[PDB]
Design a protein around this ligand. Structure first.
Ligand code: HDD
Ligand code: HEB
Ligand code: HEB
Lengths: 432, 330, 30
């Protein structure tokens, strides 16, 4: 246990860091797009209220960004620290994208900084749109490149194993692996979406309470509509990624949907409870999706989990996450799909609290679905790294340091999150 | 393995490139902290910290470019250095977390703006040391002592006359470099203090720093004779550096054109750091961590170099344009 | 190939749809 506790403690710490990181990140990814769009709408419409929401957002986008950065550094460093032998092999291959994430981030950060400190000096709004285009591009570029890491972690190749030593590396093969498309896509979509619901959750708060129709109805009207779109795309690329899994890594998917047994027409599950050792409790399941319109043939035989080695299978508590993530997906999509439809273009329900409440919950639900989803996609992953890559069990270092540093960091982040939330509310209540 | 030597050659200059801005920011968020400890003015902290932070943002780019680059050329460091350097990292990261958290919170938080400058006092200095430990150990040992390698109590290698030599090689030069940068554009009648403190830190440079450049030499005689020999083979660079320092000192003593003070400073600590690296090369602490060990595929070496070029090609012009937005004189 | 490419497409679409909202039912309506 002087070099096995960390096998767990590390996982635990890393979770605690990155879990935080993401709160301050998908915002970093989705917000700038929304900002760009708001500017663009304000410009195209000559409505200098949207143009106020762009900066009204940016002003906090900053604070989000920084907290993002520090946690980013944290994880960045923690990487090789907690998992040396991993990087001993794969570092050669991961090095680049990881860099390109932050490069893309600096590239965006320049223009972000320009807009931030030229919108109050130099000329014309288009010339500030053109500064806000590179930002979102650089944001999504981060995600592309950094996700290419995870995507690669999930799947080879671009390497060769000389009795353990990883060599003969092709950049773009390892970078542009089979998972990369679905990862990049689903991640971008479910991060445009998330922030899209996050802004709606401000507009619905501010509009619900001190009903300054002014910005706060326009905000909702846009953010909700875009949120709908992004949730739809998100779901599409969800089905896509699911199909990818069903074809290439059903170890996850079969654990997500508890398909121990391999079959042609295999029903999905809405929610259940199988305690790790075959204890089927709540059982609500429907016939199969990722075959009928995905594979175009309902009787496409889904691989079963039994057919996966039990040293190669991930946990069964994964299902719950799929439930969470997907159901949030659909529900939230519905809320979105109604708001603009029914609450605006039909029966003027906007001013009803019955929406504003749900729309206040909107963003938090999405972020939850984010954390959940990440847990799902990453935890279906623990028992493969130990094979085609290298033993997870033999990836960590020492115990009596990690256990404490974990708690130090725990505290640190606890403070971060809270403080950030506080300041980030204070600002909005100051109304600049 | 040429590409592998070029990689570390450039990444060393990423660490230097970091050192440059980091000096300015950590000097600022410290000297400014004392100078505003008296009268914690939110007007002044607002006006200051509206433009300070971008630097600090730029720093972490150097830092992380370095950190992410190095392991692309040397995953075996990610094994060894990674597995060894378990604690100082986390601390440094805490210190950073603090720095940034408050850099953000202060932007729209006057409560933190005044009280949590304490934190900038703490971190602004503590960070240099917390890097200096790794920079130290990188030419030291975790299980590497004298006769033929005795296992070392890492808990008691903290206190050593070679480590504080690096703490001095850092802190004081942070102070001095920062002071020189602040002086360079000290376009005010109230710039007399900057040059006096800059003088003190220049005297610290001629002393504690260039002193430590020799403390390292007179520690290596008993520690690492190969490194000592290399360092004597590049001591002329430390001389050159001392001469450039003398040039920056002459610009200090005399004229208002501190551009040459900054160039002289640049080449000064650039060479005083670049030799300090060169001597350590070609290897990284261990004989198993020599540049050519655990031979990697060298295409992604070229790609990584491309990425470093792409990086610097922003890092530098960001600052070159940052020093044209404040002028508009071409 | 089609399903390996498709996602990013779907995304790209969703983006410019998300823009197109700003022109359709934002500029000339509600
Ligand atoms: C509790 C769930 C959980 C657990 C046990 C882990 N992770 Fe994680 N991981 C996620 C939950 C997560 C996340 C915290 O939710 C992340 C952070 C970044 C992200 O998008 O989701 C994710 C993503 C993520 C990425 C995303 C790269 C990218 O696509 O840009 C990498 C490289 C890692 N993780 C690394 C690890 C390693 C090496 C682990 C060791 C076993 C690990 N994670 C355990
Ligand atoms: C997609 C999602 C995501 C993800 C997944 C991630 C994942 C990650 N990441 Fe990240 N980032 C991000 C999103 C992100 N990210 C962003 C957005 C940014 C910007 C800022 C913020 O956060 O906001 C960053 C930033 C960042 C940073 C900073 C840079 C500088 O300083 O300049 C770092 C270091 C990192 C690391 C990292 C890592 C290591 C990882 C693992 C691999 N990042
Ligand atoms: C937030 C929001 C959201 C949403 C809505 C969703 C919705 C959804 N989804 Fe999701 N996800 C998510 C978020 C999300 N999601 C995440 C975050 C994740 C992690 C990362 C990735 O992508 O992987 C996932 C993941 C994931 C997955 C895995 C992938 C891999 O592993 O590679 C899958 C399969 C799926 C499906 C799905 C679906 C089907 C749906 C329908 C509804 N997803």
């Amino acid at each position: 246990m002087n070099g096995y506790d960390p096998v767990l403690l590390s996982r635990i710490l890393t979770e605690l860091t990155l879990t935080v990181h993401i709160i301050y990140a998908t915002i970093g990814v989705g917000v700038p797009l929304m900002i760009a769009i708001a500017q663009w709408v304000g410009i195209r419409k000559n409505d200098m209220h949207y143009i106020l929401l762009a900066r009204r957002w940016t002003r906090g986008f900053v604070i989000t960004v920084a907290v993002g950065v520090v946690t980013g550094t944290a994880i960045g460093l923690q990487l090789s620290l907690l998992w040396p032998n991993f990087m001993q092999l794969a570092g050669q291959v991961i090095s680049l994208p990881l860099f390109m994430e932050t490069f893309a981030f600096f590239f965006e950060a320049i223009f972000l900084g320009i807009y931030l400190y030229t919108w109050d000096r130099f000329e014309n709004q288009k010339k500030h749109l053109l500064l806000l285009i590179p930002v979102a591009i650089g944001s999504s570029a981060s995600a592309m490149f950094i996700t290419m890491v995870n995507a690669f972690m999930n799947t080879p190749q671009g390497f060769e194993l000389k009795n353990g030593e990883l060599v003969n590396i092709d950049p773009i093969v390892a970078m542009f692996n089979p998972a990369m498309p679905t990862k990049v896509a689903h991640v971008l979509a479910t991060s445009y979406m998330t922030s899209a619901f996050v802004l709606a959750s401000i507009a619905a708060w501010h509009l619900w309470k001190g009903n300054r129709h002014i910005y706060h109805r326009k905000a909702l009207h846009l953010t909700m509509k875009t949120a709908f779109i992004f949730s739809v795309a998100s779901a599409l690329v969800g089905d896509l990624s699911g199909k990818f899994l069903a074809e290439y890594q059903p170890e996850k998917l079969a654990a997500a949907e508890w398909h121990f047994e391999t079959s042609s027409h295999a029903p999905l599950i809405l929610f259940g409870t199988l305690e790790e050792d075959n204890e089927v409790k709540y059982a609500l399941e429907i016939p199969y999706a990722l075959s009928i319109l995905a594979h175009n043939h309902p009787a496409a035989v889904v691989t079963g989990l039994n057919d996966i080695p039990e040293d190669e299978r991930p946990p069964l508590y994964i299902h719950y996450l799929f439930d969470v993530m997907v159901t949030i997906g659909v529900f939230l999509m519905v809320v979105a799909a109604v708001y603009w439809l029914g609450s605006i273009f039909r029966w003027k329900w906007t001013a009803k609290n019955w929406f504003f409440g749900l729309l206040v919950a909107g963003g938090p639900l999405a972020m939850i679905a984010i954390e959940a989803g990440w847990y799902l996609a990453e935890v279906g992953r623990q028992p493969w790294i130990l094979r085609g890559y290298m033993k997870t069990a033999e990836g960590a270092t020492t115990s009596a340091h990690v256990d404490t540093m974990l708690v130090l960091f725990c505290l640190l982040y606890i403070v971060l999150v809270i403080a950030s939330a506080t300041v980030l509310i204070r600002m909005f209540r100051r109304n600049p | 393995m040429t590409l592998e030597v070029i990689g570390i050659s450039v990444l060393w200059l990423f660490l230097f490139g970091y050192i440059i801005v980091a000096s300015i920011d950590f000097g600022a968020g410290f000297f400014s902290v004392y100078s505003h400890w008296a009268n914690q003015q939110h007007i002044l902290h607002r006006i200051i910290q509206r433009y300070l932070s971008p630097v600090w943002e730029v720093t972490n780019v150097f830092l992380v470019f370095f950190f992410v680059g190095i392991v692309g050329f040397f995953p075996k460091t990610a094994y060894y250095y990674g597995s060894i350097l378990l604690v100082p990292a986390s601390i440094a990261i805490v210190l950073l977390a603090i720095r940034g958290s408050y850099y953000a919170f202060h932007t729209y938080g006057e409560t933190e703006r005044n009280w949590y400058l304490l934190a900038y006092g703490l971190t602004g200095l503590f960070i240099p040391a917390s890097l200096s430990i790794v920079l130290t150990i990188s030419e030291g040992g975790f299980v590497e002592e004298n006769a033929a390698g005795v296992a070392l109590d890492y808990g008691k290698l903290f206190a050593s006359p070679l480590s504080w030599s690096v703490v001095l090689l850092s802190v004081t030069s942070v102070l001095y470099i920062s002071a020189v940068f602040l002086t360079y554009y000290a376009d005010a009648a109230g710039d007399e203090q900057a040059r006096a403190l800059l003088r003190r830190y220049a005297l610290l440079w001629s002393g504690p720093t260039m002193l430590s450049a020799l403390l390292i030499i007179y520690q290596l005689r008993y520690h690492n004779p190969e490194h000592y020999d290399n360092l004597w083979n590049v001591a002329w660079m430390l001389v050159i550096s001392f001469l450039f320092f003398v040039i920056t000192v002459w610009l200090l003593g005399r004229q208002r054109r501190f551009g040459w003070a900054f160039i002289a400073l640049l080449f000064q600590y650039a060479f005083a750091f670049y030799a300090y690296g060169i001597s350590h090369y070609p290897y990284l602490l261990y004989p198993y961590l020599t540049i050519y060990d655990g031979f990697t595929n060298e295409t992604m070496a070229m790609a990584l170099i491309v990425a470093f070029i792409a990086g610097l090609l922003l890092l530098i012009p960001s600052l070159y344009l940052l020093m044209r937005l404040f002028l508009f004189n071409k | 190939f089609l399903i390996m490419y498709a996602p990013m497409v779907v995304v790209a679409l969703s983006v410019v749809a998300a823009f197109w909202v700003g022109l359709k039912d934002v500029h000339v309506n509600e």
